[PDB]
Structures are given as structure tokens and as C-alpha cells.
Design a binder for these strands. Structure first.
Ligand SMILES: [K+]
Ligand SMILES: [K+]
Ligand SMILES: [K+]
Ligand SMILES: [K+]
Ligand SMILES: [Mg+2]
Ligand SMILES: [Mg+2]
Ligand SMILES: [Mg+2]
Ligand SMILES: [Mg+2]
Ligand SMILES: [Mg+2]
Ligand SMILES: [Mg+2]
Ligand SMILES: [Mg+2]
Ligand SMILES: [Mg+2]
Ligand SMILES: [Zn+2]
Lengths: 98, 81, 199, 129, 141, 27, 214, 83
RNA sequence: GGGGCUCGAAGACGAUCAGAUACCGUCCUAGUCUCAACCAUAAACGAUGCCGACCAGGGAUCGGCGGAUGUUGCUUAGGACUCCGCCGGCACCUUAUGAGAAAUCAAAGUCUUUGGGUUCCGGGGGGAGUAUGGUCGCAAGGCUGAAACUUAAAGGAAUUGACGGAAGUGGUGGAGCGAUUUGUCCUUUGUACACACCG
């Protein structure tokens, strides 16, 4: 039984795709197959935000952010609940979270 | 089918689709039969009509509307309706 | 003016020619051109001729009770019930009961000789059921209306109060004129306003 | 590549007839396809057909009347004597009452009944019914 | 289909139905013929001669005007190439690739393309020997 | 009366030979 | 005794119909078995097989019984019914009603000279259900039914005297074997032959024929 | 559209222009020859619309057309008429 | 032969463990990099050979071309956007009028109404890609490739249930070839279990 039409990856009209290394376990996963998330967080937890914005010499100072594109293998993405097992009908939905 | 004696041997003579000429079978429940009434001058409906039957295949394809519209144009031309 | 001219006058008043940004491949035979922004303009002589053919079909049904008009839409109810009131057909409004045309043990069981619908894409369930009981269908089809199991698809704007009201009022007028109810030398006393949806 | 233009013609006609189309375009055109189409028209299985000259291999536009169940070629064009026509018709035809096998004979391209009437054998082009 | 690739392009020229010269063509037949003779005299091949007669002269197609093809006209006046033009160009490509490989040994892709080019050369040479447009013992090395 | 329509729809009306007593350009 | 719930049932009850081919002409769905009994009286009835089907449950297995029933008048009408029920007797009773409700016309022809009454299939015809494909070849008079036991019974009820058959696939699956044979018999009034080339006259449907009664 | 709504022998001429050159009833080229009129000098010098050669005015003047992927680009300040 | 950062078969050690020649941790040899010469094997997969014809709809996208556009930190064209087409390409969505054991597939369709051309290749499960012979290779191995004997199933798809050291009851009608299912909105999911994981 073939579970997915794309075989669990994104590879059409090409042969080899270079792999990445999983952020958690350092597993070798193809770049097109690995689960990829772009996390834009703040260097300061929502809580420390006020305390830090207070201890600032410069009154006008937007707190810098953190940008990171995180790579995950299937096992770690499922374990971390980044992706969850879905019903047969819902698997064909590729739309990002509504 | 006629016997060599000269008798009809078929239980019945099934209708054919007016668009695709296909035989309309007894269990073809998607098939229909449309009666288009005839109007004389002043728009009154005479009581006579022309009949078209469309197989379930042509209706399932979606070409039933266009097929019926073409058939009606032709007959209307011919009978002056 | 001619009767055709007057009817297309009312259609232009009611935006019955205003299509959608998308046009179905089996409805392209009625779309005349495409507006610059994307709207297809429906050829309204084709709409008038389809209405005339539908009326010819309806008046040939010598028992109007064998005709069902349905609108799952909210702007079609008034129009559908008034069309049934004037023509003499049956009007179901809102949800069709899956089984109405098939389940002979249902209380809502009916065997209509003709099924008139408002939008083939909002009314897909009764069309699917009519594909199981040899029921011919008349529908008011938009540019994007699927044409499966539709026998007389009138090309017209469905999404819209005025369009639905005008289309049903014209169809009822044509049916009654062919029946002789509206005498040819006289107009129809009912205005199109009573076919519109009330908020 | 195009190996048998007759096969493409007959298969396109068969697909169009199944689809309910009333016209089918044939490209390329050939004398064998026009001769097969004449047999088909003579037996009433097709209507008008039109050869379109394009100073190349031509085009044929055939009117379809819904009377076709199937038309196909036999490849290879097996040698068929007059005596083997019965076996071939049993193999390919729905009944001994209807259907035609088209043969290429030195007397011309013809249906199997006409081949029997002149006692001429040849090679099988195809069939239609 | 491309003989040596999966490409399925259909780009090509489409000759007009009218096989006679357009009324605006007024060049006399002998004029175009001697123009072709000069063109071949510097060394142009029939394809280039046709290109030049098309874009620099009022000659859309030589066959329509004269009634004959360029290679036939050149053969009539004894200026046709010894090696046919397509084979000449294929051999030129082959020797260019061979020179490149004599400089570049690691170019395995160019080696594969050279194999394809020489396969095309052998095909076309076999056809030309069968049609007697090449010496019966003509050999490519 | 005062049926404001655009160029494409007036084209259709013309193609249908429709004078449209109130047919007016929307500009 | 019988209260007809459909428009067709009302007309059949009153006697507006005499034969089942008037229903066949208009492809009307038959939803009351009393219609078939009224219009096709010479119907026999035979249970082809009883099959136990099991649905695995938490506590053991839930066994139901599937009954295959073939009806027919041996004169061009055949029907097949399949009903699954908790009791065998009700499974058979339900399948007989279903078999009557699926009574279809069967076209019969002549292998050669059209002498006497039709005795075989008019043409080669095939039916498929699951992996089972059933072919029927017209046979000369006196050939009999050259078929397996399952298709022979259906051909006997259809009224076919002579026929050659061939089958491929898992015909051991009797539901598919019997369904494929029934589909093959059904597709026999559907092959267009030059004798059906005459244009249809389009008689009135019984719905519009008796709108005064209905 | 639906081919049942058209005649394959008499196709609508509006939609034949947009078909590929080879996919028409009778294939014809969509190229043409033109009488290019330069700025001041007569030099009609017929040019192929899809010319692959840099056409130069007879009096060794500036270039008149530029080869491109498709139709040749006439140089700035030149008119033309189809032939 | 050179290079040898990192990582890292083997190895050593440290843990965990009932045991732990493993999983976890540390240091690491060959190797990982390169040159010359070999090797010719992968779930080398779309598990789908190639060429050709036909047969649904749709919107994206890439390359080229044509047409129409009205705005450009633009240098009239042209670029950049926008819209409409044509050809070609990687694909995607819907649908059955098709096919299929189904999963599913717009080809895996145009098949008992069976024939466009051509190559390779399978014939219950093991023994067995084993023995032997031959051939290639330095070797590792590659290619070709049995039999004796043994066995009543093995296997595929799908259904229900049970389990998971996974996540959070008829009737009639409708769907399915069907087991079944809908109705009934513990559920979803995986399963090689069905005596049902105490498997
Ligand atoms: K993924
Ligand atoms: K090219
Ligand atoms: K494209
Ligand atoms: K049920
Ligand atoms: Mg790979
Ligand atoms: Mg291998
Ligand atoms: Mg493989
Ligand atoms: Mg491969
Ligand atoms: Mg075969
Ligand atoms: Mg074996
Ligand atoms: Mg049920
Ligand atoms: Mg699995
Ligand atoms: Zn991981």
C-alpha cells in the first residue's frame, strides 16, 4: 500500500536532493522531506519584556528578534508534536494552519 | 427482429438517445424524456408537442443541455415553431 | 417594444447577465465575452430562448403538481414559493431530504415529472437524486454552474436577489401566457418586487 | 512513430463515437482509409466524410450517426483465403447476422461478403460493426 | 521525438498552401539562380543561401519562384558540396568535441555527447552511401 | 430606466440588435 | 393487502398496465414487488446459495446469512436478488423481493436462419463483476446451455435455450459469478444492431399518460 | 468550446488565428514580408518579419532590423506595411 | 601518491543492563577530501521500458514566442509588474463517461466489442540467487545460473474487531463487486494479532 502520492517528500523532475541534519537528533533527512519551520521569536521572554524594556539606556529601542529556520526529521517532528498523525482524508490537505 | 414468418420476436423496441443514438436500457434511470409543447400564434399552447429522450450517459457527461438545445433548434426550424 | 426586448430590459435592470470571474466549459456557449476585470457577460438572448424552452416544457406538463421548485439559497425562497403559487407547482424551500425522490417509505416521498432548480451547485443533492428516478431537470445556471444531470440549463446570474426574482417572474409569466392564464392582449398584474427576497 | 495510419483513423473514430461526438477529424489521410470509409458508408455505419487537401497528407472530417459499436484494425494484415473468412468472422464478428470484415484484395478493398461474392481472398484490414 | 533526447518539441516552419510566388515577387528566375550561384561561390551552403535569399532579398521561397530546390540548382551548375551539408556540420561538431576532449579528459558528459554525435554521423553516412551521395568507401575517423 | 452598463454589455446588446432605450455608458 | 406507495404502483394496481415491457420502455424504476407479480405472473423462484458472513465483534462473531435468489418466467425476463439477514428465512424472503424488483428484459435471437422462436443470445455479450468476466456466444439450435451450474440456472430462467459461455477470474466467488451473468443478460437489449436503426417514435410515458388518474 | 457546437470543416475564423500554425485545418505561416519605409531615404528593401539577419540599408547606412527570438525588431524611426 | 579539519566502521574505555559484544557518552583506526587505476552494485523507485495516436475539465508554475495593456527611484524600444493566447516541461486539483482485486490511476483509460510498433522479463511457496560450470575482477565480489529435496498454502488489496511502552439494533433509502458502511456525526491512527499482545 502506497500511503502518499508524493511518497512523503517533495521531489519531481529531479534525482538526488541534498540532505539536512535534524535539529534535535542530527539525523540525515532529505531537504524536501524534512519538516521545516521558520520560527521568529524574541530574545526576551514575553515576561522579561517589561523588565528589559525598563533597564534600557536608550528610550527608543525596539527589542531585537530571533529568526531561525528549524529542520526536523519525521520521527522528531512527530515526537515534538510539530506534525501529528492525521486521518486519511485530512492528509491530502496541504493548507497551512487556518 | 422479425421472424422469417413475419412476426416481431422482440419483447419490445427500446428508445434511442436523441443525441448519441444509444439504446436507452430499461434500468437506465438517469435517462429522461422531455416533451416540448407546441404554440400557435398569440402564444397559446396547442396541446401537441415534440418528444426527445436523452440517455443517462449524455446527461451524466453534462452535454444534455447543449444536445437538447441543438435538437430543439433543428425541429423548431422544421415545424415552424 | 417587443416581448423579447422588454424581458431583456428587465434582465439588464436585474443584472441577470452579470457572470462570475470563472466560466464553465459547458456554459461558454452562452457567455458572450469576458469583461476586462474578469466577469463574463451572459448572452441574454440565449437566456430568453432557454426560458422560452423551459416554459414550453412546463406547460406541456398537464399536471402542475408534478413539478417541484427548490432553492437551498436564502434569496430564492420567496421567488420559488411565489413561482409555485402562480404556476401551480410544488415548492420545497431550504434543505432537500436525501431520499425524497428515492425513499418510497419516506413521508416526503415525491415523484415529480419536472424538477426546476435555482442553482445546480447549491442544489446538487436533488439533481443527484433526479439522476435516479428519470426526472428531467431545469436549472438556472451561472457561468460556473456544473452542468452534470441538467437538461435545460438557463444561463443567468444566480447569486442575487433581483436576478432570481426576475428570472422566476419571467418564467411564471411565460408559462401562464402559454397556458392562456395571462391573456395575450393583456400584461401580467404581478410585479417583480413580490418575487424578491425580504431581509 | 506512426506505424499504421488506418489504426489511428479507426481508433480515433471509435473513441469519438463512444464519446458521442458527431464529427471526427482523421490525420493523416490515405487511400486505404478513404477506401475503408467508403465501405463503412456503403453499409450505412457512417455519414458524410470530407477529404481536406492541405498539400500534405490530408485530413478527413467524418460525420458520425451513432450506428457504430466498434471499428478496428487487424495487425498484422494476415493472409485470408476465401475459405478462412468463416473462421475470421467467427473470431471477430458479434454474430453471423451483422458486422463486416474489411479485406484488401487484388480485386479491391471490400467487405468479406463482397469478397465471397467474387470468390477473392486477400489480407484483412479490419472490422466494423 | 528527438532522436537522442527526450525532448518533444514541435517548433518548425510552415510552408504556405500557395505553391506559386506571391504577386509582389518580381525577380526573374535566372536572376535568383545566378544569385544562388554567387552565394555558393564564396562558400555558403544551401541552408544559408536560402536564409539570405529570404531575409535580404524579396525571395520568400526558392522552390516557389524557380520551380526547383537550391541543392538541385547548385548540382545543375556544378557547385554542390562534396560532403553533404548536414554531414559536414555533424563532422565539424564531432571534431570540435574531440579537440575539447583532447584538452579536457575528465569531461565525461562531453564524451557521452561525442558518442551521440558519432552515432548520428554513422546513421547519416549509412543513408548517404545507400543513396550514393557519398563515395562507396567513404569513411569517418 | 437609467440602466448603467459597461462597454462589454452594450456590445452584447448591439450584437442582439438591442437599442436599450435606457442603455447608458458607466464611463 | 397492498397499498401502493408509488405512482407506478397505483397504475399497476388499477390495471393500466398489462405487461412489464411498458415499464421497460420508459426505464422507470420499479420499487414495489407487487407490480412485478401483477404484470409478470409466470415467475418461478430458486435459491442459488446461502452464504454465512461474519462481522468480528468484541464478544465473538456476529453471523448473518446472505441469500442469492434468481427469478424468471423462462420467456425473456430474469431477476437476481441478494439479501443478507440475521435469519436465513428472512434472508431468502428479502432476496425474492429484491429479485422481483430487478426483473430485466432479456433479448433473444437466432444463431442462423430466423426459423421458429428465438433460442440464443442475439450477439456476443459479456458481463463483469469483480474479477469474474462472463462471455456468452450465440449457439446453434440444439446446443443447449454450455455453461457452469451457476450461469446455467440464470440462463434457464431467462428463457435462453442455446448458448456458449466462457468465464475468467474467480467464478468460485458465486456472488460475482451470478452478478456477472445477470449483467451479461442485462446488456443484451443494449447492443445497437441494424434492426434497431429505425428511429424511435417516443410514445407517451405512463406518468403523463394517466395524470388524470394520478 | 464543445466541438458538437462547431463544424470541424468550417471552423470560426476568429479562433483559427490563435491556433498553433500546425494545428489548423490547413497549416499556414503567421509570418509575413513587409515594405519597410526608412526615415528619409526611399530604400523599400523588403524584410522578412522573422528575419535572422541584421538588414542594412543599401547605402551602408545604420542597421534597419535586429534579429530576435521571434519577430525582428525594426530600428527606431522606421515604418512598415504588410505585403 | 597527496591530504587528513570535521565526522567516523573496527578498537579501547565509560555507562545502562539480569545479561548489553548494542542503543547513550568519550578517544579514535581504516575511511570521509583529492589524483591515477579498478570495482559496476542500491528501495540505482514513479517499485510504472521506449516510440506513436486518441480521449475530461481547471487553475498554478518554469522556458520561449505572439498580442493587449497602463504604472514604473527605470534607463521611445526594452526591462519590471498586469491581462489574453500558442508551443514545450516538472507537477497539482476536481470528476467518471473509463479501468482496476482494490488501493488507486486522466493514465494504470481507449481489453472476451480481446491485434499501433518494439525490447526486456514472470509462471504456487521454499531450497536459491544456493551448488556447479563458464566469464569479468588484484580482491571484495559482479554477470550467467540449477537440481535433489520440501511444502498447501505463501502473497496482494480492502473490512470488522482486538491490541499499541501512538495521538487526541432493524426497516427503507444512499455508497461499495463484497466483507462492510451511512444512519449511530469514544475518535483518529499503525498492525505481519483474530486462540485476538498472556498475541
Ligand atoms: K515533509
Ligand atoms: K527549431
Ligand atoms: K504550461
Ligand atoms: K441499511
Ligand atoms: Mg536516487
Ligand atoms: Mg539489481
Ligand atoms: Mg526495479
Ligand atoms: Mg526504470
Ligand atoms: Mg490482448
Ligand atoms: Mg515459482
Ligand atoms: Mg442498504
Ligand atoms: Mg504501513
Ligand atoms: Zn530527529
Amino acid at each position: 500500500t502506497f500511503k502518499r502520492r508524493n511518497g512523503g517528500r517533495n521531489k519531481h523532475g529531479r534525482g538526488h536532493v541534498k540532505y539536512i541534519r535534524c535539529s534535535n537528533c542530527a539525523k540525515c533527512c532529505p531537504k524536501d522531506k524534512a519538516i521545516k519551520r521558520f520560527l521568529v521569536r524574541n530574545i526576551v521572554e514575553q515576561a522579561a519584556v517589561r523588565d528589559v524594556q525598563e533597564a534600557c539606556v536608550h528610550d527608543g529601542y525596539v527589542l531585537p528578534k530571533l529568526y531561525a529556520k528549524v529542520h526536523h526529521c519525521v520521527s522528531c517532528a512527530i515526537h515534538a508534536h510539530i506534525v501529528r498523525v492525521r486521518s486519511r482524508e485530512n492528509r491530502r490537505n496541504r493548507e497551512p494552519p487556518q | 427482429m422479425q421472424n422469417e414468418v413475419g412476426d416481431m420476436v422482440d419483447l419490445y423496441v427500446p428508445r434511442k438517445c436523441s443525441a448519441t443514438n444509444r439504446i436507452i436500457t430499461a434500468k437506465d434511470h438517469a435517462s429522461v424524456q422531455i416533451n416540448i409543447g407546441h404554440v400557435d400564434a398569440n402564444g397559446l399552447y396547442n396541446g401537441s408537442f415534440t418528444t426527445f429522450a436523452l440517455s443517462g450517459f449524455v446527461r451524466a457527461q453534462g452535454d444534455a443541455d447543449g444536445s437538447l438545445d441543438r435538437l430543439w433548434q433543428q425541429k423548431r426550424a422544421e415545424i415552424k415553431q | 417594444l417587443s416581448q423579447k426586448e422588454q424581458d431583456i430590459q428587465m434582465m439588464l435592470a436585474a443584472d441577470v447577465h452579470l457572470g462570475t470571474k470563472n466560466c464553465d466549459f459547458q456554459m461558454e456557449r452562452y457567455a458572450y465575452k469576458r469583461r476586462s476585470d474578469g466577469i463574463y457577460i451572459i448572452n441574454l438572448g440565449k437566456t430568453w430562448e432557454k426560458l422560452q424552452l423551459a416554459a414550453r416544457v412546463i406547460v406541456a406538463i398537464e399536471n402542475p403538481q408534478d413539478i417541484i421548485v427548490q432553492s437551498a439559497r436564502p434569496y430564492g425562497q420567496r421567488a420559488v414559493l411565489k413561482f409555485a403559487q402562480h404556476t401551480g407547482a410544488n415548492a420545497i424551500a431550504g434543505r432537500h431530504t436525501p431520499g425524497t425522490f428515492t425513499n418510497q417509505m419516506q413521508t416526503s416521498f415525491s415523484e415529480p415529472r419536472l424538477l426546476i432548480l435555482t442553482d445546480p451547485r447549491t442544489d446538487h443533492q436533488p439533481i443527484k437524486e433526479s439522476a435516479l428516478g428519470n426526472i428531467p431537470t431545469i436549472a438556472f445556471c451561472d457561468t460556473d454552474s456544473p452542468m452534470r444531470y441538467v437538461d435545460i440549463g438557463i444561463p443567468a446570474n444566480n447569486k442575487g436577489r433581483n436576478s432570481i426574482g426576475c428570472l422566476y417572474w419571467l418564467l411564471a409569466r411565460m408559462v401562464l401566457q402559454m397556458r392562456g392564464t395571462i391573456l395575450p392582449g393583456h400584461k401580467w398584474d404581478v410585479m417583480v418586487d413580490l418575487f424578491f427576497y425580504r431581509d | 512513430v506512426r506505424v499504421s495510419v488506418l489504426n489511428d483513423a479507426l481508433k480515433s473514430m471509435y473513441n469519438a463515437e463512444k464519446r458521442g461526438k458527431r464529427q471526427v477529424m482523421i490525420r493523416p489521410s490515405s487511400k486505404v482509409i478513404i477506401k475503408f470509409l467508403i465501405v463503412m458508408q456503403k453499409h450505412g455505419y457512417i455519414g458524410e466524410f470530407e477529404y481536406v487537401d492541405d498539400h500534405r497528407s490530408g485530413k478527413i472530417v467524418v460525420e458520425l450517426n451513432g450506428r457504430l459499436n466498434k471499428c478496428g484494425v487487424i495487425s498484422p494484415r494476415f493472409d485470408v483465403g476465401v475459405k478462412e473468412i468463416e473462421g475470421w468472422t467467427a473470431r471477430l464478428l458479434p454474430s453471423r447476422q451483422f458486422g463486416y470484415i474489411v479485406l484488401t484484395t487484388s480485386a479491391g478493398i471490400m467487405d468479406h461478403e463482397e469478397a465471397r461474392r467474387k470468390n477473392v481472398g486477400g489480407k484483412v484490414l479490419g472490422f466494423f460493426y | 521525438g528527438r532522436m537522442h533526447s527526450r525532448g518533444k518539441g514541435i517548433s518548425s516552419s510552415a510552408l504556405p498552401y500557395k505553391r506559386t510566388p506571391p504577386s509582389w515577387v518580381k525577380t526573374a528566375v535566372a536572376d535568383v539562380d545566378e544569385l544562388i550561384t554567387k552565394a555558393a561561390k564564396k562558400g555558403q551552403m544551401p541552408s544559408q543561401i536560402g536564409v539570405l535569399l529570404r531575409d535580404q532579398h524579396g525571395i520568400p521561397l526558392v522552390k516557389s519562384v524557380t520551380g526547383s530546390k537550391i541543392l538541385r540548382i547548385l548540382k545543375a551548375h556544378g557547385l554542390a558540396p562534396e560532403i553533404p551539408e548536414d554531414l559536414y556540420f555533424l563532422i565539424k561538431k564531432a571534431v570540435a568535441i574531440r579537440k575539447h576532449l583532447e584538452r579536457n579528459r575528465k569531461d565525461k558528459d562531453s564524451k557521452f555527447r561525442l558518442i551521440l554525435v558519432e552515432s548520428r554521423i554513422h546513421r547519416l553516412a549509412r543513408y548517404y552511401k545507400r543513396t550514393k551521395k557519398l563515395p562507396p568507401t567513404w569513411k569517418y575517423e | 430606466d437609467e440602466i448603467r452598463v459597461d462597454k462589454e454589455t452594450m456590445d452584447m446588446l448591439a450584437f442582439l440588435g438591442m437599442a436599450d432605450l435606457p442603455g447608458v455608458e458607466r464611463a | 393487502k397492498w397499498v401502493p406507495v408509488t405512482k407506478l404502483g397505483r397504475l399497476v394496481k388499477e390495471g393500466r398496465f398489462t405487461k412489464m415491457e411498458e415499464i421497460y420502455l420508459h426505464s422507470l424504476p420499479v420499487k414495489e414487488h407487487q407490480i412485478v407479480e401483477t404484470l409478470c405472473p409466470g415467475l418461478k423462484d430458486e435459491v442459488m446459495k446461502i452464504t454465512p458472513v461474519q462481522k468480528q465483534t468484541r464478544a465473538g462473531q456476529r453471523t448473518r446469512f446472505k441469500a442469492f435468489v434468481v427469478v424468471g418466467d423462462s420467456n425473456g425476463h430474469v431477476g437476481l436478488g441478494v439479501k443478507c439477514a440475521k435469519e436465513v428465512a428472512t434472508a431468502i424472503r428479502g432476496a425474492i423481493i429484491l429479485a422481483k424488483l430487478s426483473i430485466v428484459p432479456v433479448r433473444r435471437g437466432y444463431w442462423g436462419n430466423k426459423i421458429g422462436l428465438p433460442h440464443t443470445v442475439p450477439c456476443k455479450v459479456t458481463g463483469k463483476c469483480g474479477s469474474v468476466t462472463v462471455r456468452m456466444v450465440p449457439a446453434p439450435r440444439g446446443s443447449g446451455i454450455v455453461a457452469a451450474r451457476v450461469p446455467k440456472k440464470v440462463l434457464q430462467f431467462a428463457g435462453i435455450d442455446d448458448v456458449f459461455t466462457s468465464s475468467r477470474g474467480s467464478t468460485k466467488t458465486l456472488g460475482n459469478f451470478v452478478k456477472a451473468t445477470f449483467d451479461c443478460l442485462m446488456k443484451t437489449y443494449g447492443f445497437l444492431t441494424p434492426d434497431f436503426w429505425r428511429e424511435t417514435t417516443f410514445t407517451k410515458a405512463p406518468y403523463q399518460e394517466f395524470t388524470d388518474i394520478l | 468550446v464543445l466541438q458538437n457546437d462547431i463544424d470541424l470543416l468550417n471552423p470560426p475564423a476568429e479562433l483559427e488565428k490563435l491556433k498553433h500554425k500546425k494545428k489548423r485545418l490547413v497549416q499556414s505561416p503567421n509570418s509575413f514580408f513587409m515594405d519597410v519605409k526608412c526615415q528619409g531615404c526611399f530604400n523599400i528593401t523588403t524584410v522578412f518579419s522573422h528575419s535572422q539577419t541584421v538588414v542594412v540599408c543599401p547605402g551602408c547606412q545604420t542597421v534597419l532590423c535586429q534579429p530576435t527570438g521571434g519577430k525582428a525588431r525594426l530600428t527606431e524611426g522606421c515604418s512598415f506595411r504588410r505585403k
